[PDB]
C-alpha cells in the first residue's frame, strides 16, 4: 500500500509487505544468453492483435498503462511456450533516469533504456483476478527499448503523456494499434516468473523478445517527464521504475532460436 521505487519504499523493502518477493520464481532475471538453451519443443509464437481495442491510458503512480477491452478475444497471444489463449489486458513500460538503465530484464547483464510489457491473461480462468491465483495465469511479452531512431508507432503514446502527468490521471486512448510497438523478429527467451511489482505474484510465463525496438531520445525524455506524485504534490519524476534482476533459483531460460 505504500511501495514504490525510492530508497525508503523501493524493491529492497517490498518483502516486508509482500514476502513472496524472496520467492522461488521472481522476476525479472538476467538472461545469460550462453546458458539459455534452444528448445525445439517451442511452437511458433502467435501475436494476434488485429482486432485490439484500446480504451484508455492511466498514470497509476508507478507507470502508465494503456488499457484494452478484454471482454472478448480481440487481441491474443498464443503459441510459443503457451497452452491455450491469453488475452491482452494492458501494456506499460519501465524506464530509467538515463539511457544506461531502465529495463527490468537484462541480457548478459546489459540494461536497456526501457522495457515494454504487454500483459495477457489465460482465458481458461475467466478473469484476470482468477488468473493471478494460477501458476499459468498470465503471459507477459517483454520488449526492450534502446535509444536511436524514433519508433513511429510509439509517438501517439508519447503525445498523450502531457495529459496524464500525475498519479490517478487518465485519458481516452482509443484506436491505438499495439502492432506498431513490435520489432521485426519474434525470436524470444522464455521462463516462468512473477509480476515485477507488488503483489509480485508467481503466475507469469515471461516471453522476452531478443530484438529491441529503437526509440528516440526525445521519446524517452517524454517518459521521464511523468510524475509519480499526484496533482499539486511536490514533483517526483517518474524515472527508474524498474525492479532489478532477481535470483534465477531452480529455473531454466529457454530460447526459441539458435
Ligand atoms: N495488479 C497487478 C498488475 C501487474 C501487471 C503486470 C505487471 S509486470 N510489470 O510484471 O508486467 C505487474 C503488475
Ligand atoms: Zn511491467
Q: How far is the C-alpha of 146 from the C-alpha of 214, rounded, in Å?
A: 5
Q: How far is the C-alpha of 37 from the C-alpha of 153, rounded, in Å?
A: 32
Q: How far is the C-alpha of 80 from the C-alpha of 92, rounded, in Å?
A: 22
Cell of 184: 521485426
Indicate which residues carry an active-site annotation: 62
Question: Is the separation of the CB atoms in 75 and 69 below 8 Å?
Answer: no
Question: Which residues are CB-contacts of 108 (< 8 A; sequence separation ≥ 6)?
Answer: 30, 31, 32, 33, 34
Backbone angles phi, psi at 152, to 5 degrees: -60, -40
Asked if residue 85 belongs to a known ligand binding site, the reply is no
Ligand 1 centroid – CA 196 distance (Å): 6
Q: How far is the C-alpha of 104 from the C-alpha of 94, rounded, in Å?
A: 7
Atom of ligand 1 lying closest to residue 243 CA: 9
Which ligand places an atom closest to the C-alpha of 60? 1
Exposed e or buried b per residue across 227-238, where buried means at least 16 C-beta atoms within 10 angstroms of its C-beta:
bbbeeeeeebeb
Question: Which residues are CB-contacts of 43 (< 8 A; sequence separation ≥ 6)?
Answer: 79, 80
Q: Name the closest-CA residue to atom 11, ligand 1.
A: 117
* Probe residue for ligand 1, chosen from 61, 94, 195, 245 as the CB with the greatest number of ligand atoms within 8 Å: 195
Q: How far is the C-alpha of 215 from the C-alpha of 116, rounded, in Å?
A: 12
Domains of the chain, each with CATH number or no CATH: 1-258 (3.10.200.10)
Shortest CA distance to 164 belongs to which of 54, 59, 56? Answer: 59
Q: How far is the C-alpha of 229 from the C-alpha of 258, rounded, in Å?
A: 45
Radius of gyration, alpha carbons of the chain: 17
Q: Which residues line ligand 1 (CB under 6 A)?
A: 117, 119, 140, 195-197
Backbone angles phi, psi at 181, to 5 degrees: -105, 0
Shortest CA distance to 118 belongs to which of 24, 28, 208, 247? Answer: 208
Q: How far is the C-alpha of 102 from the C-alpha of 94, rounded, in Å?
A: 6
Beta bridge partners of 110: 107
Question: Is the separation of the CB atoms in 188 and 208 below 8 Å?
Answer: yes
Q: How far is the C-alpha of 5 from the C-alpha of 175, rounded, in Å?
A: 32
Atom of ligand 1 lying closest to residue 132 CA: 2
Ligand 1 centroid – CA 182 distance (Å): 19
Which ligand places an atom closest to the C-alpha of 141? 1
3-state secondary structure the chain: CCCCCCCCCCCCCHHHCCHHHHCCCCCCCEECCCCCEECCCCCCEEEECCCCCEEEEEECCCCEEEEECCCCCCCEEEECCCCCCEEEEEEEEEECCCCCCCCCCEECCECCCEEEEEEEEEHHHCCHHHHCCCCCCEEEEEEEEEECCCCHHHHHHHHHHHHHCCCCCEEECCCCCHHHHCCCCCCEEEEEECCCCCCCCCCEEEEEECCCEEECHHHHHHHCCCECCCCCCCCCECCCCCCCCCCCCCCCCEECCC
Using the structure block, give the residue that is written with the C-alpha cell 517518474: 238
Atom of ligand 1 lying closest to residue 142 CA: 11
- How was this structure determined? It was done by X-ray
The number of C-alpha atoms within 13 Å of 139 and in the hemisphere containing its C-beta is 28
The number of C-alpha atoms within 13 Å of 23 and in the hemisphere containing its C-beta is 20
Q: How far is the C-alpha of 192 from the C-alpha of 25, rounded, in Å?
A: 7
What's the maximum distance between 2 C-alpha atoms anywhere in the chain?
54
Shortest CA distance to 80 belongs to which of 198, 191, 211, 221? Answer: 191
Amino acid at each position: 500500500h505504500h511501495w514504490g521505487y525510492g530508497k525508503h519504499n523501493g524493491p529492497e523493502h517490498w518483502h516486508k509487505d509482500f514476502p513472496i518477493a524472496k520467492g522461488e520464481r521472481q522476476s525479472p532475471v538476467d538472461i545469460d544468453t550462453h546458458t539459455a538453451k534452444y528448445d525445439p519443443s517451442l511452437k511458433p509464437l502467435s501475436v494476434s492483435y488485429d482486432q485490439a481495442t484500446s480504451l484508455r491510458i492511466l498514470n497509476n503512480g508507478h507507470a502508465f498503462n494503456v488499457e484494452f477491452d478484454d471482454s472478448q478475444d480481440k487481441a491474443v497471444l498464443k503459441g510459443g511456450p503457451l497452452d491455450g489463449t491469453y488475452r491482452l489486458i494492458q501494456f506499460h513500460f519501465h524506464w530509467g533516469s538515463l539511457d544506461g538503465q531502465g529495463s527490468e530484464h537484462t541480457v548478459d547483464k546489459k540494461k536497456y533504456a526501457a522495457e515494454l510489457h504487454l500483459v495477457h491473461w489465460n482465458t481458461k480462468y475467466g478473469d484476470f483476478g482468477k488468473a493471478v491465483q494460477q501458476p499459468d495465469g498470465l503471459a507477459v511479452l517483454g520488449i526492450f527499448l534502446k535509444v536511436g531512431s524514433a519508433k513511429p508507432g510509439l509517438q501517439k503514446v508519447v503525445d498523450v503523456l502531457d495529459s496524464i502527468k500525475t498519479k490517478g490521471k487518465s485519458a481516452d486512448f482509443t484506436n491505438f494499434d499495439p502492432r506498431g510497438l513490435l520489432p521485426e523478429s519474434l525470436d524470444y527467451w522464455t521462463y516462468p516468473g512473477s509480476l515485477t511489482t507488488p503483489p509480485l505474484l508467481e503466475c507469469v510465463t515471461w516471453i522476452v523478445l531478443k530484438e529491441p525496438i529503437s526509440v528516440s531520445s526525445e521519446q524517452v525524455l517524454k517518459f521521464r517527464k511523468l510524475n509519480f506524485n499526484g496533482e499539486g504534490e511536490p514533483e517526483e519524476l517518474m524515472v527508474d521504475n524498474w525492479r532489478p534482476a532477481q535470483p534465477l533459483k531452480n529455473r531454466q531460460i529457454k530460447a526459441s532460436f539458435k
